[PDB]
UniProtKB/Swiss-Prot annotation, chains A, B:
Effect annotated for changing D49N: In KIDAD and HID syndrome
PANTHER family on file: CONNEXIN, GAP JUNCTION BETA-2 PROTEIN
Species of the source: Homo sapiens
Originating gene: GJB2
Transmembrane segments: 20-39, 73-93, 120-140, 174-194
Effect of V137I: May contribute to deafness
Segments in the Extracellular topological domain: 40-72, 141-173
Known outcome of mutating K152R: In a patient with congenital erythrokeratodermia; uncertain significance
Subunit-structure text: A hemichannel or connexon is composed of a hexamer of connexins. A functional gap junction is formed by the apposition of two hemichannels. Interacts with CNST. Forms heteromeric channels with GJB4.
Name used for this protein in its record: Gap junction beta-2 protein
SMART domains on file: CNX, Connexin_CCC
């Protein structure tokens, strides 16, 4: 039930008129599509085929870890999770508060645009706070903007400075580009919607 | 026929009165005894059990070589060969020239002490030139006065700086002591005989 249901409350009935309402969510899907291709496919090798040229027991495990602390596809994953949260917390705040107020004063819209159009504005703030909180780590945490073919790893139990080699570090980067590019694009659409709610107040 | 025959001409009939005439040759034997124990025994392992912690093909061979250019027991060997040469060149110069002059003027001793007691003086000079030519290398060539348990070897085809380990580097040193000690002792006896031929001219 991953994807189809997030839209049942996420693709809301009638919120705003900016052409960036759907665009942002079409990417949100696209972006979980690209990642549900990367993960199971290109990262299985991450640890397996990660070769350190040393016989020194400790080394290889330590050389992956010291070098791949939260692997990319679990970062990418966390991103899509956190940036998924505001989207579904709001949609949850709506289908609850709207269903509540309605069926309670029917037997016995200034607060529909008040309460909900307001938390939605802070959501859009949250979206770009996350989309950019990770976009940050993904760029600061991981030794530049991509990964090299080999790394020179000083992990503790290696003898001095050893070599190690990653698996498909280009295919791995390729997918770090797209997912980082779409991570920027999905930042602007988010900030354009935070801009449109700063224009008319 | 190694050792017994070198004395048949080396342990000459009646040359000088210093108590260092035999002493020096008793060591010469002792010193080939200690080496004919070391060699076949402690150095076989030199290359075999020389372990470099790397998977990198070229490395181990290059790490022995860059580190053991002329192995100790072949140096020790060369020593005993070169410092053996003056001893047997003189003894050869005698048993020839003495047999010659004798059987030629019998049918038809100022030159026995002239020619031979003179080349023997330059021999003693040669002995200590060699005994000290190697004693020099053996101390300058080989990274201090002994060998460590492990070496950090930068041999070309190793990845960066790798470890390697020697075999019995103490037993190996132990025998480098004795053979270097006796290499010094056998220097002094040689220089005392060059001294006694500098005292009375």
């Amino acid at each position: 039930d991953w994807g189809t249901l997030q839209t049942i409350l996420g693709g809301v009935n009638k919120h705003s008129t900016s052409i960036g309402k759907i665009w942002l969510t079409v990417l949100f899907i696209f972006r979980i599509m690209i990642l549900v291709v990367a993960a199971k496919e290109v990262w299985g090798d991450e640890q397996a085929d990660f070769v350190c040229n040393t016989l020194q027991p400790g080394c290889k495990n330590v050389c992956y870890d010291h070098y791949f602390p939260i692997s990319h596809i679990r970062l990418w994953a966390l991103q899509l999770i956190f940036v998924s949260t505001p989207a579904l917390l709001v949609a949850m705040h709506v289908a609850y508060r709207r269903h509540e107020k309605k069926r309670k004063f029917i037997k016995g819209k200034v607060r529909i645009e008040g309460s909900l159009w307001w938390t939605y504005t802070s959501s859009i703030f949250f979206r770009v706070i996350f989309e950019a909180a990770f976009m940050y780590v993904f760029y600061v945490m991981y030794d530049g903007f991509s990964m090299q073919r080999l790394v020179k790893c000083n992990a503790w139990p290696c003898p001095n400075t050893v070599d190690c080699f990653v698996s498909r570090p280009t295919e791995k980067t390729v997918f770090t580009v797209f997912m980082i590019a779409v991570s920027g694009i999905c930042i602007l659409l988010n900030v354009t919607e935070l801009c449109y709610l700063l224009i008319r107040y």
